[PDB]
Amino acid sequence: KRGPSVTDKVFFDVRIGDKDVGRIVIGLFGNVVPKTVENFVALATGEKGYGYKGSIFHRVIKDFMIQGGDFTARDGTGGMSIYGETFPDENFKLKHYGIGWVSMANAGPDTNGSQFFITLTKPTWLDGKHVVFGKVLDGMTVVHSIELQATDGHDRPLTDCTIVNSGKIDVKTPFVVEVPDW
C-alpha cells in the first residue's frame, strides 16, 4: 500500500575466498533518489569502464553493517562516482529503517563516491547523515555469511569477500516497499 517504489535492481555474485556463496539482489528507489541510484547502477554494470566487479567488502562489523565499494584503493580511502570524485547528498527522504537497507558511506556532507553499506541493525544514529537508496530483496543469507567472517584489527575480513560479478535486472513494473510513515 504505502511506501517507496523499487524501480531498478542490481545483483552482486559473491565469493568468499574461492567458494561462491551466492547472489545479493538490491532493489533501488529510483524515484526518490534518482542521481544516487543512477550512480550505483552504472557502477554495478561497469558501463563507464570501471565499477564494483572484483571489489571486496573491506569493513565488516558484526550486528552493525558490511561496507564495500572501494574499487580504487580497496582499503576504504577511495572509490569514485560517475559524477566525479564526490557528489552532493541528494536528499535524506529515506531513513535506515531496519536490517538490509543500503546506504552511502561518506566522509562528511556531500562526499558520496562509490562506497556503500548494507545495515545489519536499525542504525537510527545515521539517519540524516547518509543517503539511503536501496534495500536487499534477496540474498540476506549471503550478507550474514560475510558478517560471520573473522576480521583483522581494522575490521577487514581475513579472507576476501569478493563481488565476482555484478549487474542490473530491469523491473517491468515498480512495486512498493511498505515503510512506516511515507
Binding site: 569493513r59 562489523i61 552493525f64 553493517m65 561496507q67 572501494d70 576504504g76 580511502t77 577511495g78 572509490g79 546506504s103 558511506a105 561518506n106 566522509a107 562528511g108 562526499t111 563516491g113 562506497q115 553499506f117 542504525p123 544514529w125 545515521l126 547518509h130 581494522h154
Partner: peptide
C-alpha cells in the same frame, strides 16, 4: 563507536 566513514574511521 559505530560510524560508516571513508578515510578517517572513528570510534
Amino acid at each position: 563507536x559505530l560510524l560508516v566513514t571513508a578515510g578517517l574511521v572513528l570510534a
